Enzyme design. Structure first.
Site, PDB file in Angstrom:
ATOM      1  N   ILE A   1      35.010  31.868  54.622  1.00  0.00           N
ATOM      2  CA  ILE A   1      33.997  32.909  54.698  1.00  0.00           C
ATOM      3  C   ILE A   1      32.637  32.362  54.291  1.00  0.00           C
ATOM      4  CG2 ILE A   1      33.248  35.202  53.916  1.00  0.00           C
ATOM      5  CD1 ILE A   1      36.269  35.724  53.188  1.00  0.00           C
ATOM      6  N   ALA A   2      32.536  31.866  53.068  1.00  0.00           N
ATOM      7  CA  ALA A   2      31.270  31.371  52.522  1.00  0.00           C
ATOM      8  C   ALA A   2      31.426  29.995  51.892  1.00  0.00           C
ATOM      9  CB  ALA A   2      30.723  32.338  51.483  1.00  0.00           C
TER      10      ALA A   2
ATOM     11  N   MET B   1      29.117  26.459  43.680  1.00  0.00           N
ATOM     12  CA  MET B   1      30.232  26.681  42.744  1.00  0.00           C
ATOM     13  C   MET B   1      31.605  26.429  43.390  1.00  0.00           C
ATOM     14  SD  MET B   1      28.939  27.204  39.807  1.00  0.00           S
ATOM     15  CE  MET B   1      27.176  27.129  39.507  1.00  0.00           C
TER      16      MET B   1
ATOM     17  N   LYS C   1      37.658  33.002  45.882  1.00  0.00           N
ATOM     18  CA  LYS C   1      36.624  31.991  45.587  1.00  0.00           C
ATOM     19  C   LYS C   1      37.317  30.830  44.904  1.00  0.00           C
TER      20      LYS C   1
ATOM     21  N   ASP D   1      23.301  36.260  40.481  1.00  0.00           N
ATOM     22  CA  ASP D   1      23.043  35.939  41.903  1.00  0.00           C
ATOM     23  C   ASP D   1      22.731  37.155  42.793  1.00  0.00           C
ATOM     24  OD1 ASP D   1      23.172  33.038  42.779  1.00  0.00           O
ATOM     25  OD2 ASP D   1      25.016  33.139  41.517  1.00  0.00           O
TER      26      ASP D   1
END
Length: 277
Positions: free
Chosen positions: A17-18, A22, A40, A139
């Site tokens: 996805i992203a 990090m 994540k 963020d």
């Protein structure tokens, strides 16, 4: 590869996805429940440091315990071994059905005053939940402000790794860019930058590189907002874009209260006096 890996024998990664500093965000399938989630996967470098893994677990536990419609839930978290990659920390979260604010702003350009103020208040209210709990997003950017089909705002991708130690620079708070620890007021600043863009149609600071834009956040005062805008809306955004975090609204709540006042037709209330710690 990373695709097909079942983290802790539960979360099977399927699609990317992203991608960030990090780590990566993957679309995974939960073996247990059958639902699709967002995972994540943090870098092995952070995971190798013991001080990080302690602080991550603590920040993840508090974030997961958060229950509010305006926040994309954090379901699970942990550490999983991958062959050749070693032990890496992961975070499991809600796979939000919505359109991110950056996408909306690319099509619309400049949001209507009614709609821009509505999402600012909503984002503020949602942030306050985290801020009261002792958390900081770190963020806040339109990419992490998702709009559901109903019109509700959902905040995604909390800065959990930033807590344990161009697109980032475009909305970074001055204190963050200077190297200081973030605070709820940093989220207020970044949401102001989002506000400035939503209401004017352009970001306050631009440049060839990220370091150039981040330095503009520290040194350069924001350019004046369009004259056709109301003075009350203009003031509200200018208050949140002040370089000293003590001179801005303490958290998301006081900011949301201010947005509500502007929506009513009143001047944005002054931030409360900074008490001495």
């Amino acid at each position: 590869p990373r695709v097909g890996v079942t983290l802790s024998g539960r979360y099977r990664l399927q699609r990317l996805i992203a991608t960030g500093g990090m780590g990566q965000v993957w679309e995974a399938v939960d073996n247990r429940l059958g639902r699709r989630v967002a995972v994540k996967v943090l870098k092995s470098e952070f995971s190798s440091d013991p001080e990080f893994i302690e602080r991550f677990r603590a920040e993840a536990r508090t974030t997961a315990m958060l229950n509010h419609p305006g926040i994309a839930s954090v379901h699970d978290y942990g550490e999983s071994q991958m062959n050749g990659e070693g032990r890496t920390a992961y975070l499991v979260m809600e796979l939000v059905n919505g359109e991110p604010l950056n996408s909306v702003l690319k099509r619309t350009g400049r949001l209507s005053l009614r709609h821009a103020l509505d999402m600012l208040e909503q984002t503020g209210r949602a942030l306050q939940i985290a801020h009261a709990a002792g958390l900081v997003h770190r963020d806040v950017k339109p990419g992490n402000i998702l709009i559901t089909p109903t019109g509700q705002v959902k905040i995604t991708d909390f800065g959990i790794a930033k807590a344990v130690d161009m697109g980032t620079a475009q909305y970074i708070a001055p204190e963050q860019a200077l190297g200081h620890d973030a605070s709820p007021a940093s989220d207020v600043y970044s949401l102001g930058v989002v506000g400035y863009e939503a209401v004017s149609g352009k970001r306050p600071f631009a440049g060839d590189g990220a370091l150039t834009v981040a330095m503009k956040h520290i040194k350069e005062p924001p350019p004046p907002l369009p004259p056709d805008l109301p003075p009350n809306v203009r003031e509200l955004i200018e208050i949140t874009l002040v370089k000293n975090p003590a001179m801005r609204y303490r958290s998301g709540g006081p900011f949301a209260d201010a947005v509500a006042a502007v929506r009513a037709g009143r001047r944005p209330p002054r931030p409360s006096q900074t008490p001495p710690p």
